[PDB]
Amino acid sequence: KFYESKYASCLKMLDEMKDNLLLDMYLAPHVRTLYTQIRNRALIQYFSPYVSADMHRMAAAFNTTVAALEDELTQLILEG
Amino acid sequence: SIDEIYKYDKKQQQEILAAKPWTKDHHYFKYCKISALALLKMVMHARSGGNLEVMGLMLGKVDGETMIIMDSFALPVEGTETRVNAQAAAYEYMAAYIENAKQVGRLENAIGWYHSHPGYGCWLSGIDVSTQMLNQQFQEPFVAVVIDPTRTISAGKVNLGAFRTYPKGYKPPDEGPSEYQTIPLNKIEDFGVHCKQYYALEVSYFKSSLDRKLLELLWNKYWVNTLSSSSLLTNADYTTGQVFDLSEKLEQSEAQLGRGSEDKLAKATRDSCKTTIEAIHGLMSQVIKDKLFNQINI
Amino acid sequence: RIIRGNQLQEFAAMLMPHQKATTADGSSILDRAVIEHNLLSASKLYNNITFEELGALLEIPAAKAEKIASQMITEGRMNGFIDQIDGIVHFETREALPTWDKQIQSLCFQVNNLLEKISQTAPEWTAQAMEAQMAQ
Amino acid sequence: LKYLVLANMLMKSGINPFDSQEAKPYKNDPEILAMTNLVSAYQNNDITEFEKILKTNHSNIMDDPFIREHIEELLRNIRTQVLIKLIKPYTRIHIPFISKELNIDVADVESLLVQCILDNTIHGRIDQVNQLLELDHQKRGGARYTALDKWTNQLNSLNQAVVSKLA
Amino acid sequence: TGQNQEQFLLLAKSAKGAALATLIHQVLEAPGVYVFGELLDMPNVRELAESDFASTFRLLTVFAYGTYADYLAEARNLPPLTEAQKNKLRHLSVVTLAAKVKCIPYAVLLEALALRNVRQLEDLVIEAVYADVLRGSLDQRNQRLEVDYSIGRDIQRQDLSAIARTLQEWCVGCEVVLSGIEEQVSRANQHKEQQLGLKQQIESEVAN
Amino acid sequence: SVMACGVTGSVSVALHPLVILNISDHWIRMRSQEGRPVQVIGALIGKQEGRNIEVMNSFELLSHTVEEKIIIDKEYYYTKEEQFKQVFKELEFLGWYTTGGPPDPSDIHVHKQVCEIIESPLFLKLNPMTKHTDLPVSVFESVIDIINGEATMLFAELTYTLATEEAERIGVDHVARMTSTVAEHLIAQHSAIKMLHSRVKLILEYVKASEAGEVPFNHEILREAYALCHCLPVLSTDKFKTDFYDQCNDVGLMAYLGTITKTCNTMNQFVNKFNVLYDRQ
Ligand SMILES: [Zn+2]
């Protein structure tokens, strides 16, 4: 779903795994980094083929609100 | 007599070829006289190759310490600059061309070879030196002409050199001024290795009485082409290529100052000067055009 | 030159039935050749043109003008590009500084033609005023 | 032989099954003629013909599950190349136009364009607000400015290194 | 024009009042004939001025000096013209506009030629380029006509001086540029030699 | 004067000066060999882009005379073609050249032989014994007309321009001149401008002579001078202004970076010497 650009279902399944993978011995102390790295990468892969993109469709595709997406994107432009 | 040089004396050439005065002195040949026709044809061929090296044969004769080039013709060969004696692949073609030329009154025989160095100056590489040494061993009297069509255009002056090699083991005498040229970093190593294995002849040009007349009458209309040159964009990619090189040269000159070849910065400064001076001359022609045709009004 | 429908109507009437051969849906080889000729000819008159106007000038629907222009561009038989939102085809302009140099050439060639015509029609004054240049 | 032609088309692109050796006289068979038509349609990249043969020879192809599973992948493989032939003369192209030209839903057009630009098969970008494809075309003399850029960087570091000498 | 000049001058020297008056309607309704300088300067046509066929001479004056708007302002006095002659006069008006400026907007053309839609204007410009009257290209988006070359129509015996007024303005222009070079070249030497001299002084202090 | 003398044809011939020099050299060499002027004959090669013909190179042709008629050796030409196609692959046979005055019956006879090789060949004639002040080169096309029931070939003259190749211009200029970086670079422009200034002054003096009187009035010539006056200024558009100042700022920035490099070098020299005299390294 990450390769097919289906980021909604991808983050849905990833958040469904999150709490269960949090219980793993060696995997847990990285669960913050990995998930943040994945999400960010997804955001880039989503905006890669666009010159002008609607933020409402993007917020709906990333399971978040438009203002939260605006903050996240502002952070992603500032460094990423 | 302007046209005296066009007279061909076969017996006199045979007498000179039997005498072989060049065997008595390795600096025997000092001058290279090139016809306006051969110059134009070689520069036109060189430009037609674009950024790729081309080569051809030169027809002519000898007269004392002077080598005379009357005509030239392109050779359909691959590997100019990479293959030693690349001309050899055109042997058959050269024999037929000359045979056919003799049928129409071209009497002069092979006097040398020419090839182009697009955007990297007139000199002989290692491959060129091997080729010319072969030619001087088996085809003497022979001369090597090198033309830079790209620098001709950018400098507004013909960039041509005529060269002859020294035999294996023989050392040149004391005097060697060596007129400076910017050599790109991908060629400078080979240049330095072989630069003392040959010498440069003094080049001059000639034209006939009819050429003289026709060129004056051509000028009466060809002046229009001088005020519509547009040299800055015709071969732009050259100056941008040179700047790239200049940048890498400056990187090396910075590495020289870092901790610790003879002053790389001064060389790079003369290179940047030359490139910039050519660019400003281009702008000079453009501004001249703007002053003459645009600033007039009603 | 652009060939009009009317002029083709008369020419088509000059032909034998066998010479009016049709490729597909009723459209003839000639019909299509004339459209393509006219498109290329229009590319020499304009820097850019709308499909509505191009269709009107070529006496074809605007969609057909776009479709055939698009085909000719893809096939490499015409140089240009299409803006589908603005509905405009842009033809190879070749403008900027090279055009300025070519206009200077035209002006100076006009100068030479004018001097040659002065010398041909009145050589007396041509010589009389020619000596004045050497006098300065 | 049907699975061989399916593999010839999925390989991208064998396009010569009955031109090989043993399959030469078998192309005339009325059972596998559908695959000959489909492999020729895939060879020339025609979606209309491919779908016409898939509608005419419906039971001959879609009853078998091994061909039906990869027929969508194959269809998309044709659609990609036809789109590439369609985008060439345009600089800005409408999405609804492509939707009506390829005969595929607007959302699936944008999904195909997203996947295709991500794999670098189509050079351009999508304007989702105005619903169009802004194709990559704007190219000028950018080689000079990059050379001047590196010249600037090297001159910066050099002048710093020259001033570093004195104290 | 060139062939038509001799062809109609031959008839002009062998024609009288009414025949000349109809010949004016024949030269204006003929393709390629856009200059009427030799025909207007004829004594045979000078007789028609202030006579029975005065409006025809005024029509020839409009076709050789004036524009289509000048014809529209005096259409009640001037004889009626067909679509071909109206077109021709429009072509000549575009030539006058092109003589004024290089880039002509569609608005000025539509107002000066009295046209309603853009294609009519575009087709007239095509007819101009096809009759070798104008050279150039049309720009649809910016709504402008880019003129490359336009022919000469007006002879103007009294206003001839203006031509020289610009020619001299070009001459002086050249005379500046030339002198400029002469000076700059001189400066380029004036620096060089000076610098060489200075170097020769520095090199003389090496011995000390 | 048996030739066409009527309507124009292709009327787009661009001639390269290399071709003129080839023909001059051919004539000079044969004259040198025979000790008398000889009519020389050859082939013209180049490119054809629609109705634009570009004459780029030429080569000598072999011929014989049967009784009084000139016969071109066709086998020689096809051999030569096999040879030039190896090094000028993009070029094509465009026509032929010879030396002399206005076209004659012999030229038509030979032209028909060349027409057996290519469909519509050009004919170029060079007069090496010209008495006049204009370049003695003319170019012709052949037209096939019917005069009193006889289908005959005639020549129609074409106007031509000189080529605009930068390397060729520099070569030709260098040849024509045959003798600081600035002083020697703007001399060809200074001579070109001087030539233009002469033409402009001659036309201006013709205008004033006509207007003042005495000198014959001409509607057509002063009309063209009016048309020439209206061609000034060349390119006053805003796009051209943006492009001209783009050029000027590019060269300006490049000059600034070049001067920076030179000053960087001068700074390096100074500090290298200061660390020796005023400092102990
Ligand atoms: Zn070499």
From Swiss-Prot, chain A:
The PCI domain is necessary and sufficient for the interactions with other CSN subunits of the complex. Mediates the interaction with CAPN8. Component of the CSN complex, composed of COPS1/GPS1, COPS2, COPS3, COPS4, COPS5, COPS6, COPS7 (COPS7A or COPS7B), COPS8 and COPS9 isoform 1. In the complex, it probably interacts directly with COPS2, COPS3, COPS4 and COPS5. Interacts directly with inositol kinase ITPK1. Interacts with CAPN8. Interacts with USP48. Interacts with ASB4; this interaction negatively regulates GPS1. The lineage of its organism: Eukaryota, Metazoa, Chordata, Craniata, Vertebrata. Widely expressed. It comes from the Eukaryota. The gene is GPS1. This is COP9 signalosome complex subunit 1. The chain holds residues 332 to 411 of 491 of the full protein. Essential component of the COP9 signalosome complex (CSN), a complex involved in various cellular and developmental processes. The CSN complex is an essential regulator of the ubiquitin (Ubl) conjugation pathway by mediating the deneddylation of the cullin subunits of SCF-type E3 ligase complexes, leading to decrease the Ubl ligase activity of SCF-type complexes such as SCF, CSA or DDB2. The complex is also involved in phosphorylation of p53/TP53, c-jun/JUN, IkappaBalpha/NFKBIA, ITPK1 and IRF8/ICSBP, possibly via its association with CK2 and PKD kinases. Belongs to the CSN1 family.
Curated annotation (Swiss-Prot), chain B:
Zn(2+) binds at H115, H117, D128. GO terms for biological process: exosomal secretion; negative regulation of apoptotic process; positive regulation of DNA-binding transcription factor activity; positive regulation of transcription by RNA polymerase II; post-translational protein modification; protein deneddylation; protein neddylation; proteolysis. It is found in: Cytoplasm, Cytosol; Nucleus; Cytoplasm, Perinuclear region; Cytoplasmic vesicle, Secretory vesicle, Synaptic vesicle. CDD domains: MPN_RPN11_CSN5. Residues 32-169 form the MPN domain. Its main location: cytoplasm. SUPFAM superfamilies: JAB1/MPN domain (SSF102712). Component of the CSN complex, composed of COPS1/GPS1, COPS2, COPS3, COPS4, COPS5, COPS6, COPS7 (COPS7A or COPS7B), COPS8 and COPS9 isoform 1. In the complex, it probably interacts directly with COPS1, COPS2, COPS4, COPS6 and COPS7 (COPS7A or COPS7B) and COPS9 isoform 1. Interacts with COPS9 isoform 2. The CSN complex interacts with the BRISC complex. Also exists as monomeric form. Interacts with TP53, MIF, JUN, UCHL1, NCOA1, HIF1A, CDKN1B, BCL3, GFER, PGR, LHCGR, SMAD4, SMAD7, ID1, ID3, ITGB2 and TOP2A. Part of a complex consisting of RANBP9, Ran, DYRK1B and COPS5. Interacts with IFIT3. This is COP9 signalosome complex subunit 5. It comes from Homo sapiens.
From Swiss-Prot, chain D:
Residues 1-140 form the PCI domain. Disulfide bonds: none annotated. It comes from the Eukaryota. It is found in: Cytoplasm; Nucleus. Phosphorylated by CK2 and PKD kinases. Essential component of the COP9 signalosome complex (CSN), a complex involved in various cellular and developmental processes. The CSN complex is an essential regulator of the ubiquitin (Ubl) conjugation pathway by mediating the deneddylation of the cullin subunits of SCF-type E3 ligase complexes, leading to decrease the Ubl ligase activity of SCF-type complexes such as SCF, CSA or DDB2. The complex is also involved in phosphorylation of p53/TP53, c-jun/JUN, IkappaBalpha/NFKBIA, ITPK1 and IRF8/ICSBP, possibly via its association with CK2 and PKD kinases. Belongs to the CSN2 family. Component of the CSN complex, composed of COPS1/GPS1, COPS2, COPS3, COPS4, COPS5, COPS6, COPS7 (COPS7A or COPS7B), COPS8 and COPS9 isoform 1. In the complex, it probably interacts directly with COPS1, COPS4, COPS5, COPS6 and COPS7 (COPS7A or COPS7B). Specifically interacts with the ligand binding domain of the thyroid receptor (TR). Does not require the presence of thyroid hormone for its interaction. Interacts with CUL1 and CUL2. Interacts with IRF8/ICSBP1 and with nuclear receptors NR2F1 and NR0B1. Interacts with NIF3L1. This is COP9 signalosome complex subunit 2. It comes from Homo sapiens (Human).
From Swiss-Prot, chain F:
Widely expressed. GO terms for cellular component: COP9 signalosome; cytoplasm; cytosol; nucleoplasm; nucleus; perinuclear region of cytoplasm. The keyword Cytoplasm applies. InterPro entries: EIF3F/CSN6-like_C, JAMM/MPN+_dom, MPN, MPN_CSN6. It is found in: Nucleus; Cytoplasm; Cytoplasm, Perinuclear region. Residues 13-146 form the MPN domain. Residues 180-281 are annotated as: Interaction with Vpr. The keyword Translocase does not apply. Gene3D superfamilies: Cytidine Deaminase, domain 2. Component of the COP9 signalosome complex (CSN), a complex involved in various cellular and developmental processes. The CSN complex is an essential regulator of the ubiquitin (Ubl) conjugation pathway by mediating the deneddylation of the cullin subunits of SCF-type E3 ligase complexes, leading to decrease the Ubl ligase activity of SCF-type complexes such as SCF, CSA or DDB2. The complex is also involved in phosphorylation of p53/TP53, c-jun/JUN, IkappaBalpha/NFKBIA, ITPK1 and IRF8, possibly via its association with CK2 and PKD kinases. This is COP9 signalosome complex subunit 6.
